[PDB]
Design an enzyme around this catalytic site. Structure first.
Site, PDB file in Angstrom:
ATOM      1  N   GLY A  10     -20.171  15.367  18.880  1.00  0.00           N
ATOM      2  CA  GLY A  10     -21.044  16.019  17.630  1.00  0.00           C
ATOM      3  C   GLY A  10     -20.449  16.470  16.602  1.00  0.00           C
ATOM      4  O   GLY A  10     -20.810  17.067  15.771  1.00  0.00           O
ATOM      5  N   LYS A  12     -17.519  16.957  13.156  1.00  0.00           N
ATOM      6  CA  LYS A  12     -17.476  15.959  12.253  1.00  0.00           C
ATOM      7  C   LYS A  12     -16.104  16.134  11.666  1.00  0.00           C
ATOM      8  O   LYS A  12     -15.590  17.209  11.607  1.00  0.00           O
ATOM      9  CB  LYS A  12     -18.343  16.385  10.681  1.00  0.00           C
ATOM     10  N   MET A  13     -15.352  15.184  11.399  1.00  0.00           N
ATOM     11  CA  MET A  13     -13.732  14.900  10.843  1.00  0.00           C
ATOM     12  C   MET A  13     -13.666  14.579   9.627  1.00  0.00           C
ATOM     13  O   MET A  13     -14.164  13.580   9.368  1.00  0.00           O
ATOM     14  CB  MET A  13     -13.238  14.211  11.948  1.00  0.00           C
ATOM     15  N   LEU A  16     -10.140  12.655   4.914  1.00  0.00           N
ATOM     16  CA  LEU A  16      -8.884  12.805   4.206  1.00  0.00           C
ATOM     17  C   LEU A  16      -8.245  13.786   4.961  1.00  0.00           C
ATOM     18  O   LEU A  16      -8.828  15.210   4.947  1.00  0.00           O
ATOM     19  CB  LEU A  16      -8.922  12.919   2.871  1.00  0.00           C
ATOM     20  N   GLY A  19      -0.898  14.635   6.391  1.00  0.00           N
ATOM     21  CA  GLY A  19       0.059  14.278   7.407  1.00  0.00           C
ATOM     22  C   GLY A  19       1.335  15.375   7.188  1.00  0.00           C
ATOM     23  O   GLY A  19       1.597  15.871   6.212  1.00  0.00           O
ATOM     24  N   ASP A  44      -2.974  16.811  10.216  1.00  0.00           N
ATOM     25  CA  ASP A  44      -2.278  16.035  11.357  1.00  0.00           C
ATOM     26  C   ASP A  44      -0.855  16.501  11.606  1.00  0.00           C
ATOM     27  O   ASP A  44      -0.001  16.478  10.478  1.00  0.00           O
ATOM     28  CB  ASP A  44      -2.401  14.309  10.689  1.00  0.00           C
ATOM     29  N   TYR A  49       7.058  16.895  15.484  1.00  0.00           N
ATOM     30  CA  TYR A  49       7.506  16.936  14.051  1.00  0.00           C
ATOM     31  C   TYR A  49       8.404  18.142  13.888  1.00  0.00           C
ATOM     32  O   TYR A  49       8.799  18.296  12.754  1.00  0.00           O
ATOM     33  CB  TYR A  49       6.122  16.878  13.152  1.00  0.00           C
ATOM     34  N   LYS A  78      -0.617  16.403  19.019  1.00  0.00           N
ATOM     35  CA  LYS A  78      -0.685  15.334  19.734  1.00  0.00           C
ATOM     36  C   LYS A  78       0.390  15.721  20.797  1.00  0.00           C
ATOM     37  O   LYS A  78       1.533  16.305  20.596  1.00  0.00           O
ATOM     38  CB  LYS A  78       0.088  14.155  18.983  1.00  0.00           C
ATOM     39  N   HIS A 111      -0.177  10.746  21.948  1.00  0.00           N
ATOM     40  CA  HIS A 111       0.871  10.480  20.714  1.00  0.00           C
ATOM     41  C   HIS A 111       1.235   8.900  20.790  1.00  0.00           C
ATOM     42  O   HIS A 111       1.239   8.190  19.716  1.00  0.00           O
ATOM     43  CB  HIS A 111       2.137  11.211  20.487  1.00  0.00           C
TER      44      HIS A 111
HETATM   45  N1  LIG Z   1       0.581   8.819  15.395  1.00  0.00           N
HETATM   46  C1  LIG Z   1       1.806   8.284  15.215  1.00  0.00           C
HETATM   47  O1  LIG Z   1       2.471   7.765  15.761  1.00  0.00           O
HETATM   48  C2  LIG Z   1       2.270   8.768  13.608  1.00  0.00           C
HETATM   49  C3  LIG Z   1       3.225   7.728  13.081  1.00  0.00           C
HETATM   50  C4  LIG Z   1       3.533   8.114  11.511  1.00  0.00           C
HETATM   51  C5  LIG Z   1       2.735   8.771  11.007  1.00  0.00           C
HETATM   52  N2  LIG Z   1       1.748   9.629  11.410  1.00  0.00           N
HETATM   53  C6  LIG Z   1       0.996  10.728  10.705  1.00  0.00           C
HETATM   54  O2  LIG Z   1       0.407  10.039   9.532  1.00  0.00           O
HETATM   55  C7  LIG Z   1       1.147  10.896   8.360  1.00  0.00           C
HETATM   56  C8  LIG Z   1       1.465   9.882   7.012  1.00  0.00           C
HETATM   57  O3  LIG Z   1       2.302   9.036   7.352  1.00  0.00           O
HETATM   58  P1  LIG Z   1       3.923   9.153   7.007  1.00  0.00           P
HETATM   59  O4  LIG Z   1       4.323  10.452   6.940  1.00  0.00           O
HETATM   60  O5  LIG Z   1       4.578   8.095   7.856  1.00  0.00           O
HETATM   61  O6  LIG Z   1       3.928   8.340   5.664  1.00  0.00           O
HETATM   62  P2  LIG Z   1       2.965   8.111   4.124  1.00  0.00           P
HETATM   63  O7  LIG Z   1       1.944   9.161   4.249  1.00  0.00           O
HETATM   64  O8  LIG Z   1       2.579   6.978   4.216  1.00  0.00           O
HETATM   65  O9  LIG Z   1       4.055   8.402   3.038  1.00  0.00           O
HETATM   66  C9  LIG Z   1       4.723   9.613   2.965  1.00  0.00           C
HETATM   67  C10 LIG Z   1       5.697   9.494   1.770  1.00  0.00           C
HETATM   68  O10 LIG Z   1       5.011   9.196   0.579  1.00  0.00           O
HETATM   69  C11 LIG Z   1       5.516  10.212  -0.224  1.00  0.00           C
HETATM   70  N3  LIG Z   1       4.335  10.441  -1.405  1.00  0.00           N
HETATM   71  C12 LIG Z   1       3.124  11.088  -0.936  1.00  0.00           C
HETATM   72  N4  LIG Z   1       2.379  11.181  -1.799  1.00  0.00           N
HETATM   73  C13 LIG Z   1       2.880  10.471  -2.978  1.00  0.00           C
HETATM   74  C14 LIG Z   1       2.355  10.097  -4.272  1.00  0.00           C
HETATM   75  N5  LIG Z   1       1.027  10.410  -4.561  1.00  0.00           N
HETATM   76  N6  LIG Z   1       3.114   9.470  -4.938  1.00  0.00           N
HETATM   77  C15 LIG Z   1       4.225   9.067  -4.424  1.00  0.00           C
HETATM   78  N7  LIG Z   1       4.911   9.251  -3.489  1.00  0.00           N
HETATM   79  C16 LIG Z   1       4.154   9.932  -2.703  1.00  0.00           C
HETATM   80  C17 LIG Z   1       5.950  11.454   0.305  1.00  0.00           C
HETATM   81  O11 LIG Z   1       6.825  12.260  -0.394  1.00  0.00           O
HETATM   82  P3  LIG Z   1       6.898  13.709  -0.580  1.00  0.00           P
HETATM   83  O12 LIG Z   1       6.612  14.088   0.735  1.00  0.00           O
HETATM   84  O13 LIG Z   1       8.563  13.979  -0.813  1.00  0.00           O
HETATM   85  O14 LIG Z   1       6.096  14.026  -1.832  1.00  0.00           O
HETATM   86  C18 LIG Z   1       6.605  10.914   1.623  1.00  0.00           C
HETATM   87  O15 LIG Z   1       7.970  10.405   1.190  1.00  0.00           O
HETATM   88  C19 LIG Z   1       2.420  11.400   9.129  1.00  0.00           C
HETATM   89  O16 LIG Z   1       3.048  12.541   8.247  1.00  0.00           O
HETATM   90  C20 LIG Z   1       1.933  12.027  10.336  1.00  0.00           C
HETATM   91  O17 LIG Z   1       0.980  13.271  10.207  1.00  0.00           O
HETATM   92  C21 LIG Z   1       1.572   9.565  12.979  1.00  0.00           C
HETATM   93  C1  LIG Z   2       7.630   6.873  14.179  1.00  0.00           C
HETATM   94  C2  LIG Z   2       8.243   8.249  14.525  1.00  0.00           C
HETATM   95  N1  LIG Z   2       9.480   8.190  14.620  1.00  0.00           N
HETATM   96  C3  LIG Z   2      10.064   9.044  14.810  1.00  0.00           C
HETATM   97  C4  LIG Z   2      11.909   8.957  14.963  1.00  0.00           C
HETATM   98  C5  LIG Z   2      12.400   7.838  14.861  1.00  0.00           C
HETATM   99  C6  LIG Z   2      12.110   6.680  13.717  1.00  0.00           C
HETATM  100  C7  LIG Z   2      12.832   5.464  13.929  1.00  0.00           C
HETATM  101  C8  LIG Z   2      13.982   5.066  14.651  1.00  0.00           C
HETATM  102 CL1  LIG Z   2      14.674   3.726  14.741  1.00  0.00          CL
HETATM  103  C9  LIG Z   2      14.181   6.224  15.731  1.00  0.00           C
HETATM  104  C10 LIG Z   2      13.417   7.195  15.641  1.00  0.00           C
HETATM  105  N2  LIG Z   2      12.609  10.068  15.288  1.00  0.00           N
HETATM  106  C11 LIG Z   2      12.163  11.187  14.917  1.00  0.00           C
HETATM  107  C12 LIG Z   2      13.122  12.246  15.306  1.00  0.00           C
HETATM  108  C13 LIG Z   2      12.788  13.611  15.098  1.00  0.00           C
HETATM  109  C14 LIG Z   2      11.413  13.910  14.920  1.00  0.00           C
HETATM  110  C15 LIG Z   2      10.393  13.041  14.752  1.00  0.00           C
HETATM  111  C16 LIG Z   2      10.661  11.756  14.824  1.00  0.00           C
HETATM  112  C17 LIG Z   2       9.832  10.452  14.738  1.00  0.00           C
HETATM  113  C18 LIG Z   2       8.421  10.742  14.743  1.00  0.00           C
HETATM  114  O1  LIG Z   2       7.758  11.666  14.923  1.00  0.00           O
HETATM  115  N3  LIG Z   2       7.784   9.422  14.482  1.00  0.00           N
HETATM  116  C19 LIG Z   2       6.439   9.636  14.064  1.00  0.00           C
HETATM  117  C20 LIG Z   2       5.440   9.696  15.281  1.00  0.00           C
HETATM  118  O2  LIG Z   2       5.655   9.040  16.162  1.00  0.00           O
HETATM  119  O3  LIG Z   2       4.139  10.037  14.877  1.00  0.00           O
END
Ligand SMILES: NC(=O)c1ccc[n+]([C@@H]2O[C@H](COP(=O)([O-])OP(=O)(O)OC[C@H]3O[C@@H](n4cnc5c(N)ncnc54)[C@H](OP(=O)(O)O)[C@@H]3O)[C@@H](O)[C@H]2O)c1
Ligand SMILES: Cc1nc2c(-c3ccc(Cl)cc3)nc3ccccc3c2c(=O)n1CC(=O)O
Length: 316
Positions: A10, A12-13, A16, A19, A44, A49, A78, A111
């Site tokens: 119930g 709301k998320m 946007l 991360g 998120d 992290y 997570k 996660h």
């Molecule tokens: N559940 C999971 O396993 C999992 C895995 C991966 C990610 N996530 C979550 O998803 C979030 C987003 O994914 P992500 O961090 O992998 O990467 P992303 O959001 O796809 O890309 C982040 C990168 O893009 C840059 N950036 C952001 N806005 C920009 C813009 N307007 N113009 C140019 N560059 C821009 C950032 O630079 P700066 O920060 O230097 O500005 C950073 O280097 C994560 O932070 C995390 O919260 C979850």
């Molecule tokens: C996809 C992912 N990879 C890593 C990795 C990572 C990513 C790529 C390689 Cl090949 C090995 C490890 N290292 C971390 C080290 C410290 C803190 C966080 C991480 C994380 C991490 O948080 N993520 C994001 C996630 O799982 O949400």
């Protein structure tokens, strides 16, 4: 475009969110302050992290400033892979709550489906570089997550990086108490996730798209790898709307009824990334962006390809 999506509890998320993976502790407090100023209401987070205290500082400051009240925020964290044992789940959640300085989470996710050996190291390795698994299973970890809702620590629970068969496993569990509200998965024009999105949405599970900008700051990234932000074809779609490529990449999942969580620590980009409620991608734009799919994952968890619960052998 309504700015929030209804969950199965119930609540709301916000569609946007901000991360926080790779947001250094020395910069993420300011990033979250700016994001809240700007209008973000969804953050998120994750224990892995290594910055939840600094996220929590920012939230606390903005609550003290009277900028937002707690009920208006949607805080996600997570359960890391080293805490899948049923006896470790509550402590992991409470550590996240303590670091974030919160008394509940809006959403708490498993996660990854893979359990890792418990201990101090987040990615425990053997002497040959293999991730050391734990003797844990999806269904027992899910039951331990359900207890967190019953105790009021979290309002909703979900999963992340689960394939459809792993989702099905939970859905079909005898004596299920809560269905997962969300599956958070990688999704962008190079990994469009058509089948898993169709599956989850058909089952009443909201999908969050992570790495929507292609995670250019990820730690393995090879120079020859595809680059969404630099894609000249997406640049042309952006130019036609007088928007940036990043804004197109954020709007894209929004028009697929997904939640999306771009990460930035750069104030101008935090603001830019939120300015996505004032334009629409056309049918043709959507079709063109979808056509860029290559099934190309930036978060493939390659260290775990031999794990029993590795999620990415299945087609979806
Ligand atoms: N559940 C999971 O396993 C999992 C895995 C991966 C990610 N996530 C979550 O998803 C979030 C987003 O994914 P992500 O961090 O992998 O990467 P992303 O959001 O796809 O890309 C982040 C990168 O893009 C840059 N950036 C952001 N806005 C920009 C813009 N307007 N113009 C140019 N560059 C821009 C950032 O630079 P700066 O920060 O230097 O500005 C950073 O280097 C994560 O932070 C995390 O919260 C979850
Ligand atoms: C996809 C992912 N990879 C890593 C990795 C990572 C990513 C790529 C390689 Cl090949 C090995 C490890 N290292 C971390 C080290 C410290 C803190 C966080 C991480 C994380 C991490 O948080 N993520 C994001 C996630 O799982 O949400």
């Amino acid at each position: 475009m309504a700015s929030r999506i209804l969950l199965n509890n119930g609540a709301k998320m916000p569609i946007l969110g901000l991360g926080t993976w790779k947001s250094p502790p020395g910069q993420v407090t300011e990033a979250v302050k700016v994001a809240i100023d700007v209008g973000y209401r969804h953050i998120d987070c994750a224990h892995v992290y290594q910055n939840e205290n600094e996220v929590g500082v920012a939230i606390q400051e903005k609550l003290r400033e009277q900028v937002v009240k707690r009920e208006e925020l949607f805080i996600v964290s997570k359960l890391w892979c080293t805490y899948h044992e049923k006896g470790l789940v509550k402590g992991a959640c409470q550590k996240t709550l303590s670091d974030l300085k919160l008394d509940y989470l809006d959403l708490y996710l498993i996660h990854w489906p893979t359990g890792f050996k418990p201990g101090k190291e987040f990615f425990p390795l053997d002497e040959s570089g293999n991730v050391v698994p734990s003797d844990t299973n999806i269904l027992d970890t899910w039951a331990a997550m359900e207890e967190l809702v019953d105790e009021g620590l979290v309002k909703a629970i979900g999963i992340s990086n689960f394939n459809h068969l792993q989702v099905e496993m939970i859905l079909n569990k005898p004596g299920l108490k809560y269905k997962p509200a969300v599956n958070q998965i990688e999704c962008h024009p190079y990994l469009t996730q058509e089948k898993l999105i169709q599956y989850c949405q058909s089952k009443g599970i909201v999908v969050t798209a992570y790495s929507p900008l292609g995670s250019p700051d990820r730690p393995w990234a090879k120079p020859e790898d595809p680059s969404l932000l630099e894609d000249p074809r997406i640049k042309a779609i952006a130019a036609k709307h007088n928007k940036t490529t990043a804004q197109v990449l954020i709007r894209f999942p929004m028009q697929r009824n997904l939640v999306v969580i771009p990460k930035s620590v750069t104030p101008e980009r935090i603001a830019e990334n939120f300015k996505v409620f004032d334009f629409e991608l056309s049918s043709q734009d959507m079709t063109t962006l979808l056509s860029y799919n290559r099934n190309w994952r930036v978060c493939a968890l390659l260290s775990c390809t031999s794990h029993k619960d590795y999620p990415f052998h299945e087609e979806f």
